């Protein structure tokens, strides 16, 4: 059926929790990204058929956050929009959903991606409507409940990472080493300009004037192995997962224009990459960090490739323990993986994260002249999503 | 392109706000409906390839509510699931998304539909995370914010209904006469058993015994025109929209098994209807209730049909004002519209509503032997979505 291409790929900088982007709602991050993605694609906003955006922490954001980003971007009100929640997978799944809708014959141009502002998540009173009646209750952190807590096992995602570390014997030192390598690669990438083509600046209009945020602030420049080794376990006693070898709580939007190859040609667009195949898979929730293994194999099976064939891989770093397990099992050449750093350094804005690694992948492919790329990531609740790209000449 | 069929269509009863389903989470409503939809389709849980469910009031429901419903229904962990938010359209749009994925070649059997428990929606504190510092603040009703408030114009959905009453010159009396006829049709339908096939019971098992809910709670039997005429306006001074000519706040889940025709044949399934075509469209948010006009026209054009060819129509009754505007402009034969009553009587459980009308439409097409059917509904934020069905021989 129809061939599907990426026309443009843009993201905001990734803000740290409570920091640079704390005053910028997710839908405004999304709007910023959508407007620049349409500009970079060289198409008219009236060319767009649908908007499909990932967002996990929807609480109190108002009706249909994807529609709000679309409106705030200046897209025509006649364009339909919907918000997707697949937890960590959400922003990458909207890209394969776009490809599906285009393959189905129903659209030619779709805005896809994700947006999250974890800094802005509310607290909840679940029984305020009809009453608590008597006794103390929980004032619930919505970011943890909706984003970070396994709904079946009643523990944090971090415990799923410990579960993998324990089953696979991925040691603290192996996790810390992996974290250090991610940090060094992010520092090198930031300072050498690797992210300039993909980052749209966010212009913040405060009281005392305008501020511009255009750089990823989560990396820890000058990280050392001894500094990593001093940290304490974050999730259990004598555990292996720490704040230094797990990603953060972060804010970002990442948006792509997805088109049929035929429409792209008709509109004079020069695509960045072809979407060759994709997949999604479920796993036991207790080992969610493993979901990429099954999503990636299904997708590769469709592509007719092998892992050795891949020139660049983005495999998300929610936790070193999970990235290492997926890497061992799929036998990745680690030199081709997260070549500009990964989420331990860069951050993990949940609803945007999978879109964010895809933006990073397609730019890196364009700059290094790589042919075959893979983007894949784990999903809270025990899933995975993967997309395979082939560069356009 | 693969043909796509509805294998089964099941819903819970529609509960009134704070009443019969107040103690049943949306995901448990969803799991009840999934389990019965799978049974009715005559398939096995392992035949399901993906779960895609609408849910609007996601706040504090935990990671990926669709995934939770799937797991609770006894579907395998390996199955991917995602939660869709298109406000009122959510539960209908997952069905057309299911069709699109099957058409794209990526699945044969998908659980679709929606779930909502408005009674259970939390209250929010938006600045509890970093602090209020000083001064009173808003304790935010999440049901209103995320479900019922226009994000662009900063007023209730009820004001958009008033806007349509004014611009289409639809009187208070016209709205009331419409409401009364819905109430009468619902009463007659309920008492003659029209919904008995489609409704799956919900068993509420507390500490001390069990209660069965299997009937729609919201209808006001013995409604009168004088009873309606006396009501106060709900949304503005001297308004035309009231509690009597607007739908309610309600709890429900509605689920369909969606399959390719070839898979249904292989598995021995006797499908209820073919999905012929579908459409989504945007409109000014200020008149969101007109959304179905454009969505319906798109879907009819794509099907190669006409409005006059339709045998049964489900056009959602979010407000009489909007239902009447849509019916006038599409020139519906009103004896074919909402023949078992509509949402003014039955309720509007936002995330499920779209799926609920489709369930009602397919059962009514079976019972009345009607060949061509339309389901369509308005969407807060200025959208509409529609699906066209053709009965299976």
XYZ file of C-alpha atoms in Angstrom:
786
model
C 0.000 0.000 0.000
C 1.084 3.695 0.268
C 4.604 4.555 1.386
C 4.812 6.754 4.501
C 7.459 9.361 5.155
C 8.625 11.795 7.846
C 8.467 15.358 6.447
C 9.839 17.175 9.512
C 10.789 16.427 13.092
C 10.999 19.031 15.818
C 11.179 19.120 19.605
C 11.421 21.565 22.390
C 14.341 21.402 24.726
C 13.820 18.953 27.613
C 13.256 20.742 30.870
C 14.115 19.488 34.309
C 11.486 19.003 36.968
C 10.373 22.277 38.438
C 12.828 24.241 36.375
C 13.117 25.831 32.923
C 9.737 24.913 31.496
C 7.733 24.856 34.764
C 5.587 27.787 33.598
C 4.827 26.480 30.141
C 1.793 24.169 29.891
C 2.146 20.973 27.852
C -0.318 22.242 25.252
C 1.900 25.359 24.733
C 5.003 23.154 24.315
C 2.970 21.156 21.803
C 1.797 24.285 19.969
C 5.401 25.583 19.717
C 6.532 22.306 18.224
C 3.554 21.882 15.868
C 4.030 25.362 14.401
C 7.707 24.853 13.680
C 7.175 21.257 12.345
C 4.673 22.560 9.773
C 7.120 25.411 8.790
C 10.008 22.925 8.429
C 7.942 20.500 6.349
C 7.246 23.315 3.874
C 3.522 22.673 3.782
C 0.462 24.779 4.445
C -1.459 24.258 7.641
C -4.577 23.620 5.489
C -2.774 20.575 3.993
C -2.998 18.834 7.424
C -5.732 16.166 7.727
C -5.552 15.197 11.495
C -3.588 15.861 14.678
C -2.748 12.879 16.925
C -0.695 13.641 19.994
C 0.470 11.697 23.060
C -0.088 13.120 26.563
C -0.232 11.105 29.789
C -0.785 13.553 32.612
C -4.029 14.954 31.254
C -5.509 15.812 34.626
C -6.943 19.336 34.673
C -5.433 20.208 31.304
C -8.878 20.819 29.828
C -10.802 19.173 27.016
C -8.694 17.300 24.467
C -5.161 18.521 24.985
C -4.156 17.591 21.354
C -6.946 19.873 20.099
C -5.711 22.705 22.307
C -2.142 22.389 21.014
C -3.545 22.304 17.399
C -5.646 25.500 18.020
C -2.814 27.327 19.803
C -0.445 26.444 16.898
C -2.753 28.234 14.466
C -3.978 25.165 12.677
C -7.420 25.560 11.036
C -10.333 24.601 13.345
C -11.725 22.267 10.657
C -8.800 19.737 11.403
C -9.743 16.943 13.794
C -7.549 16.143 16.761
C -7.239 13.433 19.426
C -5.095 12.727 22.453
C -3.487 9.293 22.891
C -2.381 7.736 26.180
C -0.168 4.677 26.047
C 1.955 5.910 28.963
C 5.600 5.947 27.819
C 4.753 4.785 24.328
C 2.253 7.462 23.586
C 4.250 9.910 21.493
C 5.840 7.113 19.369
C 2.548 5.253 18.910
C 0.890 8.294 17.396
C 3.539 8.056 14.587
C 2.655 4.459 13.735
C -1.070 5.288 14.095
C -0.492 8.099 11.538
C 1.190 5.575 9.208
C -1.793 3.192 9.678
C -4.352 5.853 8.860
C -2.376 6.879 5.746
C -2.047 3.131 4.689
C -5.756 2.827 5.247
C -6.408 5.484 2.587
C -7.903 8.034 4.909
C -5.369 10.804 5.152
C -2.306 12.125 3.448
C -0.780 14.450 6.067
C -0.931 13.925 9.872
C 0.729 15.841 12.732
C 2.038 13.245 15.255
C 4.158 13.235 18.409
C 3.739 13.935 22.127
C 3.831 16.553 24.821
C 4.233 16.407 28.555
C 4.767 18.779 31.401
C 5.483 16.675 34.536
C 6.415 19.820 36.577
C 2.811 21.021 36.245
C 0.966 17.797 37.333
C -1.708 18.397 39.996
C -2.555 16.745 43.264
C -5.951 14.966 43.546
C -8.684 14.506 46.113
C -10.472 11.486 44.845
C -13.433 11.627 47.226
C -14.068 15.352 47.381
C -17.145 15.056 45.161
C -19.381 12.910 47.408
C -17.317 13.163 50.593
C -14.647 11.498 52.750
C -17.165 11.119 55.651
C -14.384 10.660 58.286
C -10.718 9.907 58.620
C -7.501 10.883 56.885
C -7.106 10.135 53.233
C -4.523 10.438 50.484
C -3.797 13.700 48.749
C -2.669 11.949 45.557
C 0.286 12.911 43.396
C -1.253 12.657 39.948
C 2.111 12.474 38.180
C 3.033 9.302 40.143
C -0.392 7.696 39.922
C -1.106 8.267 36.280
C 2.449 8.141 34.961
C 4.844 6.230 37.211
C 2.912 3.643 39.235
C 2.129 0.125 38.112
C -1.638 -0.281 38.350
C -1.522 -4.055 38.818
C 1.394 -4.583 41.268
C 1.014 -1.316 43.273
C 4.610 -0.251 43.066
C 6.712 2.292 41.226
C 8.155 1.757 37.737
C 11.575 1.816 39.510
C 10.720 -1.511 41.095
C 10.145 -2.997 37.653
C 13.698 -1.832 36.816
C 15.017 -3.514 40.009
C 13.086 -6.661 38.964
C 14.985 -6.699 35.626
C 18.365 -5.885 37.286
C 17.746 -8.851 39.668
C 16.583 -11.348 36.989
C 19.352 -10.511 34.532
C 22.096 -9.785 37.136
C 22.732 -6.314 35.784
C 24.897 -4.847 38.463
C 24.983 -1.412 39.994
C 28.392 -0.886 38.493
C 27.213 -1.933 34.944
C 24.195 0.428 35.337
C 26.446 3.294 36.518
C 28.848 2.787 33.751
C 26.087 2.900 31.182
C 24.737 6.083 32.807
C 28.187 7.701 32.670
C 28.523 6.860 28.950
C 25.046 8.388 28.281
C 26.035 11.580 30.159
C 29.332 11.892 28.255
C 27.637 11.378 24.904
C 24.931 13.985 25.742
C 27.565 16.547 26.804
C 29.510 15.967 23.565
C 26.340 16.195 21.470
C 25.136 19.404 23.149
C 28.497 21.160 22.874
C 29.181 20.064 19.337
C 25.772 21.342 18.147
C 24.107 17.981 17.277
C 20.707 19.131 18.496
C 20.533 22.561 16.817
C 18.618 21.417 13.789
C 15.900 19.635 15.887
C 15.246 22.025 18.831
C 12.640 24.793 18.496
C 13.168 27.516 21.060
C 10.439 28.139 23.637
C 9.861 31.853 24.280
C 8.583 32.550 27.719
C 6.704 35.814 28.327
C 6.913 36.496 32.056
C 6.380 39.691 34.083
C 9.947 41.013 33.837
C 10.175 40.295 30.062
C 11.001 37.400 27.641
C 13.212 34.383 28.393
C 14.272 31.840 25.744
C 14.768 28.155 26.497
C 16.622 26.289 23.808
C 18.983 23.898 25.519
C 18.459 20.566 27.262
C 19.113 21.169 30.961
C 18.925 17.738 32.488
C 22.426 16.482 31.634
C 24.988 16.438 34.412
C 28.195 17.751 32.686
C 31.382 16.459 34.264
C 29.675 13.386 35.702
C 32.099 10.800 37.113
C 31.911 7.135 37.975
C 32.808 7.892 41.655
C 29.974 10.488 41.880
C 27.563 7.856 40.501
C 28.773 5.223 42.925
C 28.136 7.453 45.927
C 24.410 7.734 45.231
C 21.887 5.853 47.280
C 19.229 3.425 45.928
C 16.100 5.250 44.977
C 13.465 2.543 45.146
C 14.442 -0.138 47.583
C 16.823 -0.961 50.364
C 20.195 -2.244 49.050
C 18.842 -1.750 45.508
C 20.817 -1.052 42.358
C 18.698 1.727 40.786
C 19.527 5.249 41.738
C 18.699 8.794 40.619
C 21.945 8.623 38.622
C 21.125 5.541 36.542
C 17.435 6.244 35.991
C 15.918 9.095 33.976
C 14.186 12.070 35.480
C 10.832 13.821 35.554
C 10.878 16.139 32.565
C 9.005 18.463 30.357
C 9.006 18.566 26.482
C 7.063 18.352 23.289
C 8.202 16.538 20.128
C 6.231 16.735 16.906
C 6.538 15.256 13.422
C 4.770 15.767 10.105
C 3.919 12.375 8.635
C 2.871 12.181 5.011
C 2.225 9.728 2.161
C 5.205 9.693 -0.188
C 2.787 10.646 -3.007
C 1.543 13.778 -1.184
C 5.040 14.752 -0.267
C 6.050 14.638 -3.930
C 2.963 16.565 -4.997
C 3.653 19.306 -2.411
C 7.348 19.554 -3.220
C 8.396 18.218 0.174
C 11.825 16.616 0.509
C 11.218 13.871 3.148
C 13.730 13.020 5.788
C 13.051 9.273 6.066
C 10.640 6.531 5.109
C 8.734 4.640 7.797
C 9.499 1.039 6.853
C 7.689 -0.764 9.628
C 6.532 -0.520 13.264
C 5.113 -2.691 16.082
C 3.695 -2.816 19.631
C 3.737 -5.700 22.134
C 2.759 -6.438 25.693
C 4.669 -8.098 28.439
C 4.064 -8.827 32.139
C 3.702 -5.434 33.878
C 6.376 -6.467 36.455
C 8.996 -6.448 33.685
C 7.676 -3.643 31.537
C 11.194 -2.412 30.718
C 11.519 -5.483 28.469
C 8.631 -4.561 26.116
C 11.027 -3.217 23.439
C 12.483 -6.687 22.882
C 9.138 -8.005 21.514
C 8.041 -4.789 19.761
C 11.486 -4.552 18.090
C 11.481 -8.135 16.862
C 7.994 -7.849 15.392
C 9.038 -4.658 13.600
C 12.307 -6.016 12.292
C 10.422 -9.105 11.076
C 8.328 -6.792 9.014
C 11.333 -4.827 7.696
C 13.367 -7.810 6.450
C 16.376 -6.420 8.264
C 18.627 -7.621 11.010
C 20.064 -5.767 13.942
C 23.513 -5.846 12.391
C 21.989 -4.022 9.419
C 21.021 -0.993 11.572
C 23.239 2.048 11.343
C 21.662 4.001 14.251
C 19.507 2.951 17.178
C 17.605 5.015 19.683
C 16.604 2.742 22.570
C 15.064 4.706 25.386
C 16.830 4.953 28.731
C 14.000 4.997 31.295
C 16.372 2.971 33.454
C 19.905 1.703 32.753
C 18.803 -1.683 33.973
C 16.101 -2.012 31.311
C 18.149 -0.473 28.453
C 21.002 -2.880 29.243
C 18.658 -5.947 29.239
C 17.081 -5.004 25.908
C 20.605 -4.290 24.491
C 21.984 -7.708 25.596
C 18.974 -9.576 24.326
C 18.802 -7.868 20.895
C 22.672 -7.871 20.711
C 22.982 -4.183 19.818
C 26.341 -2.765 18.830
C 26.445 -0.187 21.601
C 28.512 2.160 19.504
C 25.425 2.772 17.283
C 23.004 3.207 20.213
C 21.983 6.620 21.568
C 24.914 8.218 19.833
C 23.978 11.728 21.118
C 23.192 10.492 24.680
C 20.066 9.045 26.061
C 17.277 9.790 28.524
C 19.419 9.223 31.669
C 21.150 12.386 30.628
C 18.483 14.072 28.542
C 15.288 13.316 30.499
C 12.114 11.348 30.061
C 8.975 13.476 29.528
C 6.603 10.566 29.471
C 4.009 11.425 26.812
C 6.671 12.928 24.582
C 9.601 10.568 25.174
C 9.039 8.164 22.321
C 8.405 11.023 19.879
C 11.536 12.710 21.252
C 13.842 9.755 20.502
C 12.339 9.512 17.001
C 13.128 13.238 16.364
C 16.645 12.639 17.641
C 17.002 9.497 15.458
C 15.912 11.110 12.190
C 18.221 14.092 12.590
C 21.140 11.930 13.574
C 20.478 9.748 10.472
C 20.512 12.893 8.255
C 23.736 14.183 9.822
C 25.739 11.021 9.934
C 24.405 9.784 6.640
C 22.983 6.569 8.129
C 20.601 4.438 6.106
C 18.667 2.207 8.503
C 17.495 3.362 11.943
C 15.462 1.933 14.870
C 13.612 3.863 17.572
C 12.150 1.789 20.440
C 11.009 2.194 24.069
C 9.386 0.514 27.122
C 5.864 1.400 28.372
C 4.559 1.493 31.958
C 1.938 -1.275 32.360
C 4.033 -3.772 30.395
C 4.239 -2.694 26.767
C 6.695 -1.665 23.988
C 6.633 0.275 20.709
C 9.167 0.378 17.801
C 9.552 2.159 14.505
C 12.076 1.422 11.688
C 13.286 4.221 9.365
C 15.143 4.235 6.057
C 16.774 7.532 5.095
C 15.646 9.355 1.890
C 18.492 10.051 -0.498
C -8.972 -3.299 1.094
C -10.269 -5.580 3.842
C -13.892 -5.351 4.788
C -14.451 -4.576 8.462
C -17.373 -5.890 10.572
C -18.810 -5.507 14.042
C -18.826 -8.968 15.672
C -20.572 -7.983 18.908
C -21.787 -4.837 20.653
C -22.376 -4.676 24.397
C -22.879 -1.942 26.979
C -23.483 -1.518 30.624
C -26.600 0.296 31.741
C -26.160 4.057 31.927
C -26.017 5.192 35.538
C -27.098 8.510 36.867
C -24.684 10.942 38.529
C -23.945 9.878 42.063
C -26.258 6.880 41.809
C -26.343 3.270 40.647
C -22.709 2.971 39.326
C -21.064 5.450 41.718
C -19.038 2.668 43.278
C -17.804 1.044 40.040
C -14.653 2.445 38.511
C -14.708 3.139 34.761
C -12.113 0.455 34.181
C -14.333 -2.129 35.903
C -17.284 -1.033 33.791
C -14.994 -1.487 30.822
C -13.778 -4.918 31.939
C -17.435 -6.086 32.390
C -18.259 -5.016 28.876
C -15.067 -6.435 27.310
C -15.635 -9.873 28.853
C -19.205 -10.029 27.563
C -18.354 -8.601 24.139
C -15.728 -11.343 23.666
C -18.245 -14.008 24.716
C -20.995 -12.655 22.428
C -18.651 -12.498 19.458
C -17.972 -16.267 19.943
C -14.196 -15.679 19.976
C -11.573 -16.419 22.612
C -9.594 -13.753 24.508
C -6.407 -14.814 22.686
C -8.015 -13.922 19.347
C -7.891 -10.196 20.270
C -4.964 -8.312 18.770
C -5.328 -4.817 20.309
C -7.574 -2.870 22.782
C -8.443 0.763 22.014
C -10.792 2.467 24.445
C -12.165 5.966 24.929
C -11.951 7.606 28.340
C -12.021 11.335 29.019
C -11.849 11.776 32.757
C -8.550 9.919 33.180
C -7.385 11.873 36.288
C -6.054 9.537 38.937
C -7.336 6.410 37.166
C -3.784 5.069 37.017
C -1.568 4.161 34.061
C -3.352 3.466 30.793
C -6.973 2.895 31.762
C -7.667 0.882 28.607
C -4.897 -1.485 29.586
C -6.411 -1.854 33.050
C -9.816 -2.712 31.603
C -8.212 -5.292 29.258
C -6.309 -6.964 32.128
C -9.370 -6.949 34.334
C -11.447 -8.526 31.572
C -9.018 -11.570 31.445
C -7.392 -10.628 28.164
C -3.717 -11.756 27.791
C -0.957 -9.364 29.023
C 0.668 -9.650 25.616
C -2.107 -7.571 24.040
C -1.336 -3.883 23.399
C -3.814 -1.305 24.676
C -4.260 2.440 24.388
C -6.644 5.052 25.818
C -8.098 7.655 23.425
C -9.431 11.103 24.374
C -11.485 12.903 21.742
C -13.936 14.147 24.433
C -17.481 13.099 23.470
C -16.300 11.381 20.311
C -13.811 9.116 22.045
C -15.853 5.926 22.165
C -16.991 6.239 18.529
C -13.593 7.226 17.186
C -11.890 4.115 18.615
C -14.198 2.056 16.355
C -13.187 3.871 13.199
C -9.517 3.715 14.380
C -9.975 -0.062 14.779
C -11.253 -0.198 11.192
C -8.266 1.818 9.969
C -5.728 -0.481 11.685
C -7.470 -3.579 10.186
C -7.512 -1.892 6.741
C -3.814 -1.106 7.060
C -3.118 -4.805 7.469
C -2.008 -4.801 11.081
C -4.742 -6.558 12.942
C -7.687 -8.876 12.490
C -9.622 -8.490 15.802
C -9.741 -5.292 17.958
C -11.693 -4.463 21.131
C -13.025 -0.907 20.756
C -15.492 1.405 22.448
C -15.305 3.579 25.598
C -15.816 3.860 29.320
C -16.628 6.680 31.740
C -17.460 7.211 35.306
C -18.348 10.840 35.819
C -19.629 10.223 39.352
C -16.094 9.262 40.375
C -14.189 12.201 38.948
C -11.781 13.840 41.423
C -11.176 17.413 42.517
C -7.738 18.922 41.783
C -5.278 21.251 43.429
C -3.130 22.585 40.535
C -0.428 24.253 42.587
C -0.006 21.827 45.480
C 3.245 20.524 43.976
C 5.318 23.743 44.179
C 3.007 25.723 46.466
C 0.271 28.321 46.530
C 2.454 30.705 48.647
C -0.517 32.865 49.781
C -4.189 33.443 49.037
C -7.242 31.337 48.261
C -7.152 29.246 45.115
C -9.414 27.096 43.030
C -10.270 23.584 44.100
C -10.999 22.390 40.600
C -13.843 20.075 39.592
C -11.991 17.778 37.122
C -15.198 16.545 35.488
C -16.090 20.091 34.481
C -12.590 21.109 33.418
C -11.588 18.060 31.451
C -15.031 17.088 30.160
C -17.468 19.961 29.961
C -15.605 23.261 29.686
C -14.558 24.960 26.485
C -10.823 25.498 26.639
C -10.828 28.388 24.097
C -13.911 30.380 25.035
C -13.873 29.719 28.799
C -17.490 28.721 29.196
C -19.503 25.560 29.671
C -20.639 23.303 26.840
C -24.170 24.536 27.745
C -23.249 27.979 26.396
C -22.288 26.458 23.047
C -25.795 24.978 23.022
C -27.282 28.425 23.765
C -25.161 29.793 20.868
C -26.708 27.252 18.523
C -30.294 27.968 19.844
C -29.715 31.693 19.083
C -28.028 31.329 15.649
C -30.436 28.659 14.309
C -33.495 30.242 16.004
C -34.455 27.198 17.931
C -36.971 28.071 20.603
C -37.346 26.816 24.165
C -40.606 25.090 23.168
C -39.002 23.352 20.216
C -36.223 22.130 22.532
C -38.737 20.917 25.117
C -40.948 19.116 22.560
C -37.806 17.390 21.324
C -36.817 16.382 24.849
C -40.296 15.079 25.595
C -40.351 12.873 22.505
C -36.957 11.388 23.536
C -38.215 10.670 26.974
C -41.325 8.975 25.531
C -39.339 6.832 23.096
C -36.930 5.771 25.821
C -39.758 4.755 28.165
C -41.496 2.719 25.450
C -38.167 1.124 24.418
C -37.143 0.175 27.920
C -40.577 -1.319 28.737
C -40.774 -3.275 25.477
C -37.296 -4.776 26.007
C -35.481 -3.017 23.224
C -32.264 -2.747 25.277
C -32.262 -6.135 26.961
C -30.005 -7.791 24.440
C -27.385 -5.026 24.421
C -27.105 -4.459 28.226
C -24.658 -6.551 30.222
C -25.355 -6.578 33.978
C -22.942 -5.003 36.411
C -22.565 -6.965 39.690
C -21.571 -4.780 42.635
C -20.098 -6.900 45.358
C -19.419 -5.049 48.549
C -18.501 -6.209 52.035
C -22.011 -7.559 52.884
C -23.768 -8.705 49.705
C -24.308 -8.142 45.949
C -26.408 -5.751 43.893
C -27.188 -6.088 40.118
C -27.453 -3.063 37.916
C -28.930 -3.763 34.517
C -31.306 -0.922 33.688
C -30.809 2.644 32.415
C -31.437 4.939 35.384
C -31.610 8.356 33.785
C -34.979 8.405 31.967
C -37.810 10.338 33.649
C -40.874 8.232 32.925
C -44.141 10.080 32.629
C -42.396 13.307 31.526
C -44.778 16.127 30.510
C -44.523 19.196 28.422
C -45.708 21.337 31.401
C -42.999 19.741 33.629
C -40.395 20.757 31.058
C -41.783 24.251 30.527
C -41.474 25.130 34.154
C -37.774 24.412 34.493
C -35.239 27.117 35.113
C -32.413 27.813 32.689
C -29.218 25.905 33.444
C -26.503 28.031 31.913
C -27.503 31.655 31.717
C -30.136 34.128 32.769
C -33.142 33.821 30.504
C -31.529 30.875 28.755
C -33.390 28.320 26.630
C -31.301 25.298 27.759
C -32.318 23.548 30.907
C -31.681 20.305 32.813
C -34.710 18.934 30.961
C -33.549 19.578 27.391
C -29.784 18.846 27.966
C -28.316 15.386 28.649
C -26.907 14.491 32.064
C -23.700 13.443 33.784
C -23.598 9.639 33.565
C -21.577 6.420 33.981
C -21.266 3.640 31.428
C -19.012 1.452 29.316
C -19.841 0.358 25.760
C -17.566 -2.144 23.904
C -17.603 -3.703 20.385
C -15.520 -6.474 18.856
C -14.292 -5.198 15.505
C -12.895 -7.779 12.995
C -11.948 -8.143 9.346
C -14.730 -9.997 7.469
C -12.164 -12.706 6.551
C -11.282 -13.335 10.201
C -14.887 -13.421 11.183
C -15.503 -16.046 8.491
C -12.541 -18.126 9.682
C -13.703 -18.063 13.313
C -17.320 -18.902 12.666
C -18.588 -15.463 13.659
C -21.884 -14.165 12.400
C -21.289 -10.412 12.111
C -23.870 -7.853 13.028
C -22.915 -5.162 10.494
C -20.269 -3.910 8.116
C -18.499 -0.671 8.782
C -18.925 1.102 5.431
C -17.350 4.465 6.064
C -16.591 7.008 8.768
C -15.540 10.588 9.149
C -14.356 13.253 11.683
C -14.508 17.033 11.247
C -13.870 20.243 13.133
C -16.036 23.314 13.606
C -15.825 26.523 15.603
C -15.717 25.479 19.275
C -18.423 28.059 20.020
C -20.886 25.928 18.040
C -19.412 22.520 18.692
C -22.815 20.908 18.697
C -22.978 21.333 14.872
C -19.986 19.043 14.427
C -22.120 16.114 13.226
C -23.213 18.063 10.125
C -19.732 18.068 8.602
C -18.710 14.620 9.908
C -21.901 13.056 8.592
C -21.530 14.711 5.196
C -17.919 13.455 4.890
C -18.818 9.897 5.843
C -21.886 9.824 3.471
C -19.776 11.062 0.569
C -17.110 8.476 1.226
C -19.725 5.681 1.392
C -21.391 6.811 -1.862
C -24.677 7.050 0.023
C -27.275 9.723 0.691
C -29.069 10.773 3.883
C -32.359 9.612 2.330
C -30.932 6.094 1.926
C -30.496 5.710 5.720
C -32.960 3.409 7.526
C -31.874 4.248 11.117
C -29.990 7.121 12.583
C -28.364 7.600 16.065
C -27.640 11.286 16.407
C -26.536 11.989 19.945
C -28.604 14.295 22.140
C -26.003 16.257 24.101
C -28.461 19.129 23.934
C -31.822 19.431 22.148
C -30.598 22.637 20.611
C -27.736 20.928 18.846
C -29.645 17.779 17.898
C -32.323 19.960 16.274
C -29.794 22.124 14.354
C -28.099 19.029 12.985
C -31.406 17.352 12.072
C -32.703 20.437 10.295
C -29.613 20.943 8.184
C -29.112 17.274 7.322
C -32.887 16.989 6.694
C -33.323 13.804 8.707
C -36.615 12.019 8.718
C -37.153 12.261 12.507
C -39.164 9.005 12.677
C -35.888 7.218 11.839
C -33.782 9.115 14.417
C -33.016 7.764 17.934
C -35.955 5.362 17.694
C -35.368 3.921 21.179
C -34.870 7.433 22.756
C -31.734 9.504 23.021
C -29.260 10.908 25.483
C -31.627 13.512 26.948
C -33.438 10.463 28.403
C -30.603 7.982 28.508
C -27.607 10.072 29.598
C -24.282 11.180 28.244
C -21.330 9.247 29.736
C -18.833 11.225 27.844
C -16.035 8.829 26.978
C -18.459 5.993 26.311
C -21.296 7.898 24.683
C -20.117 7.481 21.153
C -19.675 3.769 21.540
C -23.050 3.604 23.366
C -24.965 5.077 20.430
C -23.221 2.657 18.065
C -24.199 -0.293 20.255
C -27.775 0.919 20.298
C -27.755 1.471 16.515
C -26.475 -1.984 15.649
C -28.979 -3.774 17.949
C -31.832 -1.668 16.622
C -30.743 -2.437 12.950
C -30.780 -6.225 13.839
C -34.221 -6.053 15.534
C -35.903 -3.958 12.884
C -34.077 -5.496 9.936
C -32.858 -2.125 8.780
C -30.188 -2.060 6.139
C -28.317 1.233 6.386
C -27.495 3.029 9.610
C -25.658 6.174 10.775
C -24.154 7.005 14.193
C -22.927 10.522 14.748
C -22.275 12.885 17.639
C -20.928 16.317 18.576
C -17.582 16.768 20.385
C -16.597 19.360 22.873
C -13.814 21.564 21.452
C -15.552 21.795 18.086
C -15.549 18.415 16.398
C -17.897 15.708 15.148
C -17.460 12.088 14.257
C -19.684 9.636 12.404
C -19.806 5.983 11.285
C -22.043 4.332 8.576
C -23.130 0.700 9.036
C -24.682 -1.791 6.621
C -26.453 -4.779 7.906
C -24.878 -8.154 7.285
C -26.919 -10.625 5.206
